[PDB]
Design a protein around this ligand. Structure first.
Ligand code: JX8
Ligand code: MN
Ligand code: NA
Ligand code: NA
Ligand code: ZN
Ligand code: ZN
Length: 454
């Protein structure tokens, strides 16, 4: 009926290995990128303090229908307190099974979840919390400021997820743009059967997820190399999800039985994440799951230097699909280049290689555009435009290195792949808008080269 996928890798790093989270993720990457997800059990004495008043934490609940292959929208950025939500969640689970809330086997919850989502007769609706930290509901990890206890030793931990949007080895930290949906940690309050649909993280980034407390979270993960296999399977069984959407807050995702994927030769792995354990998702690794009961998790995206080539591939993939970007990859690269003197040495080396590809591609695109008859040009500071004012009309990519404009359509832009998609004017009426000349870009790359040599 339901055949559980094989278990994903579980790591138990020693203290020395657990020290640098980025060094450890780099160490386990050859194993875990084969499974998409993996579990990290921290050293036994790594125990961050969790303290909260369940009566003063409020949040707006989200409602969720549990029907396989039904379209759901990705969460965007009525009221429960944490106590009243917990009482609702506990009464729901215990009444669903007629068993004490904490005595329902996890195997049975898994079997029952995949039964109810597939039965048209069942009409189970659950609720959950999902948002970034705010004054009414803050991070589960300690943050600076009133007076913190001596458990401020977890303030500067690499595994304190609030430090991920600031650590140097995360290239997302250097982004000046306000991408709070991606840079800041998300807080997830779950209950029995509340679920996250199959998805990958934006720009094919990593994510790391910590379960602060509560009943386990059940995960299904698919390695990054099988991403296109999974999408082809879902295109057959749910074509309505693959209709192009007007913006980022309209993306369609769904619940789907992993046995359906396994039947179509898609490798799927599972794990039960328990309180105090991390789950790490790797670039382009599809994942979904559900909560066994009342719990509280915190998750954040991040990008290592290993990710830089994949991040460029992803934006190219977004362009082919006409999907909106969260940020401009080229803007991030150039921002780091302009800070080459204070960059980590290994970061500088990796950024330099990506920038060399960027420059070669940009040079060829400008040659192609010049051969189409675009002659006039002017420097343009793309980073000053709001993101929705610098998307290619055709493919929706966020422009930064260059774009084409015509005075007959004020404010509209196309990227250099879509010069023919702007208007019916002859190309000599167009202007190439460019952030940098080639003569600006090579010294920027040389700064990274010099920095990479100590
Ligand atoms: O990558 C993710 C992992 C887990 C979750 C999650 N945990 N509990 N409920 N949902 C989640 C939610 C929204 C977006 N992404 C998510
Ligand atoms: Mn996610
Ligand atoms: Na159902
Ligand atoms: Na994608
Ligand atoms: Zn375009
Ligand atoms: Zn025109």
């Amino acid at each position: 009926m339901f055949l559980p996928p094989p278990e994903c890798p579980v790591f138990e790093p020693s203290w020395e290995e657990f020290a640098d989270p980025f060094a450890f993720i780099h160490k386990i990457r050859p194993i875990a990128e084969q499974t998409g997800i993996c579990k990290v059990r921290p050293p036994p004495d790594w125990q961050p303090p969790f303290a909260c008043d369940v009566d003063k934490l409020h949040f707006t609940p989200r409602i969720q229908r549990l029907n396989e292959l039904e379209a759901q929208t990705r969460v965007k950025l009525r009221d429960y307190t944490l106590r009243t939500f917990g009482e609702m969640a506990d009464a729901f689970k215990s009444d669903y099974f007629n068993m004490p809330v904490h005595m329902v086997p996890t195997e049975l919850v898994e079997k029952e979840f995949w039964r109810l989502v597939s039965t048209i007769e069942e009409d189970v609706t659950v609720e959950y919390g999902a948002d970034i930290a705010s004054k009414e509901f803050g991070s589960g990890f300690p943050v600076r400021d009133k007076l913190s206890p001596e458990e401020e030793e977890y303030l500067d931990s690499g595994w304190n997820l609030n430090n991920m949007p600031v650590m140097e080895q995360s290239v997302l930290a250097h982004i000046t743009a306000d991408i709070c949906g991606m840079k800041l940690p998300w807080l997830y309050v779950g209950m029995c059967f509340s679920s996250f649909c199959w998805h990958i993280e934006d720009h094919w980034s990593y994510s790391i997820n910590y379960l602060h407390w509560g009943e386990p979270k059940t995960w299904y993960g698919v390695p990054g190399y099988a991403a296109e296999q999974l999408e082809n399977v879902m295109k057959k069984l749910a074509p309505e999800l693959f209709v192009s959407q007007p913006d980022l807050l309209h993306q369609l995702v769904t619940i789907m039985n992993p046995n359906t994927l396994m039947t179509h030769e898609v490798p799927v792995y599972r794990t039960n994440q328990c309180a105090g354990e991390f789950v790490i998702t790797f670039p382009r690794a599809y994942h979904s799951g559900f909560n066994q009961g009342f719990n509280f998790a915190e998750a954040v995206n991040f990008c290592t230097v290993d990710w830089l080539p994949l991040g460029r591939q992803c934006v190219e993939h977004y362009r082919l699909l006409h999907r909106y970007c969260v940020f401009s990859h080229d803007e991030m690269i150039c921002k780091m280049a302009s800070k080459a003197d204070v960059l980590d040495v290994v970061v500088a080396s990796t950024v330099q290689k990506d920038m060399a590809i960027m420059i070669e591609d940009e040079k060829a695109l400008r040659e192609t555009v010049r051969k189409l008859g675009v002659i006039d040009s002017e420097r343009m500071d793309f980073e000053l435009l709001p993101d929705d004012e610098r998307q290619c009309v055709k493919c929706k990519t966020t422009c930064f290195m260059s774009a084409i404009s015509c005075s007959c359509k004020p404010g509209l832009l196309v990227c250099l792949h879509h010069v023919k998609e702007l208007c019916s004017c002859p190309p000599y009426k167009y202007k190439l808008r460019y952030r940098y000349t080639l003569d600006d870009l090579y010294p920027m790359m040389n700064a990274l080269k010099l920095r990479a040599e100590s």
